Design an enzyme around this catalytic site. Structure first.
Site, PDB file in Angstrom:
ATOM      1  N   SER A 217       1.892   2.317   8.583  1.00  0.00           N
ATOM      2  CA  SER A 217       1.809   1.274   7.560  1.00  0.00           C
ATOM      3  C   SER A 217       3.206   0.899   7.096  1.00  0.00           C
ATOM      4  O   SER A 217       4.052   1.773   6.908  1.00  0.00           O
ATOM      5  CB  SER A 217       0.999   1.763   6.357  1.00  0.00           C
ATOM      6  N   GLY A 218       3.440  -0.401   6.925  1.00  0.00           N
ATOM      7  CA  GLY A 218       4.735  -0.880   6.473  1.00  0.00           C
ATOM      8  C   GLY A 218       5.724  -1.172   7.585  1.00  0.00           C
ATOM      9  O   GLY A 218       6.756  -1.793   7.344  1.00  0.00           O
TER      10      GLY A 218
ATOM     11  N   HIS B   5       0.817  -1.206   0.000  1.00  0.00           N
ATOM     12  CA  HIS B   5       0.000   0.000   0.000  1.00  0.00           C
ATOM     13  C   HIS B   5       0.855   1.262   0.000  1.00  0.00           C
ATOM     14  O   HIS B   5       0.503   2.270  -0.621  1.00  0.00           O
ATOM     15  CB  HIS B   5      -0.926   0.022   1.219  1.00  0.00           C
TER      16      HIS B   5
ATOM     17  N   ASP C 241      -0.501  -7.504   1.469  1.00  0.00           N
ATOM     18  CA  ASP C 241       0.025  -6.153   1.610  1.00  0.00           C
ATOM     19  C   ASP C 241       1.509  -6.193   1.974  1.00  0.00           C
ATOM     20  O   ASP C 241       1.905  -5.852   3.090  1.00  0.00           O
ATOM     21  CB  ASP C 241      -0.761  -5.396   2.681  1.00  0.00           C
TER      22      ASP C 241
END
Ligand SMILES: *[C@@H]1O[C@H](CO[C@@H]2O[C@@H](C)[C@@H](O)[C@@H](O)[C@@H]2O)[C@@H](O[C@@H]2O[C@H](CO)[C@@H](O)[C@H](O)[C@H]2NC(C)=O)[C@H](O)[C@H]1NC(C)=O
Length: 218
Positions: free
Chosen positions: A173-174, A41, A88
């Site tokens: 995120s990540g 993402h 993801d």
């Protein structure tokens, strides 16, 4: 990270900050000197050629000589599904190799297919928003979370903090989820807003992608 705490400087040398002209926008994990792992993402709608991979950072608001910055040379995808929020994960090959030292290190990954049982204790981390209304953190934050299988699909590793509202948030995120010393997750998405105290946070299940990861980083 909402409701977490400041990490000890360089306590997690495999922690990476992905940045653009404006600054930090996603986290990542160093899995080899020339490879970082993040959430698909994070690079879905961004100019990969403009992304700066920052290693060895702690306080993003200050100039840190411990930092090592690289560019993204190649991207390896694994079927990211933006609508269902599945797979993801993405591997970014750097334009060079990091100098492994006290502030920059390669993370340890789990065995392919290894699942985490309900109750496992992990540590989430990131430079994401400090609250359901607080902004990006300057100093890396960490948070104790517990693995939960309820209100979570088999295609995700989810976590929940009980007795109070806390969890990952925008900008996280990540980022890696460390459990039993291994990177078992990559922050993917939240439900009901950040730190709802109801919906567990969802992470990409790193263990399910180990053979894929190994085929790329050797
Ligand atoms: C809160 O989390 C810390 C750290 O979590 C551990 O280490 C992470 C890197 C990851 O591997 C997690 O799965 C681990 O649970 C916990 O710190 C540990 O505390 C015990 C004593 O309780 C101590 O013997 C260990 O050495 C500590 N580990 C480290 C690396 O600091 C802490 O226990 C957690 N607290 C709660 C209430 O969950």
């Amino acid at each position: 990270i909402v409701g977490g705490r400041r990490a000890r400087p360089h306590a997690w040398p495999f922690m990476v900050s992905l940045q653009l002209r404006g600054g930090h926008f996603c986290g990542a994990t160093l899995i080899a000197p020339n490879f970082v792992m993040s959430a698909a993402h994070c690079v879905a709608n961004v100019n990969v050629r403009a992304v700066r991979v920052v290693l060895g950072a702690h306080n993003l608001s200050r100039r840190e000589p411990t930092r090592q910055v690289f560019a993204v040379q190649r991207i390896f995808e694994n079927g990211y599904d933006p609508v269902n929020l599945l797979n993801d994960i993405v591997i970014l090959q750097l334009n060079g190799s990091a100098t492994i030292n006290a502030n920059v290190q390669v993370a340890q990954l789990p065995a392919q297919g290894r699942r985490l049982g309900n109750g496992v204790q992990c540590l989430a981390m990131g430079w994401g928003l400090l609250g359901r209304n607080r902004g990006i953190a300057s100093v890396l934050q960490e948070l104790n979370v517990t693995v939960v299988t309820s209100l979570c699909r088999r295609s995700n590793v989810c976590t929940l903090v009980r007795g109070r509202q806390a969890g990952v948030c925008f900008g996280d995120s990540g980022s890696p989820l460390v459990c039993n010393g291994l990177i078992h997750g990559i922050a993917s998405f939240v439900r009901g807003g950040c730190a709802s105290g109801l919906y567990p946070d969802a992470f990409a299940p790193v263990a399910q992608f180990v053979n894929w990861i190994d085929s790329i980083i050797q």
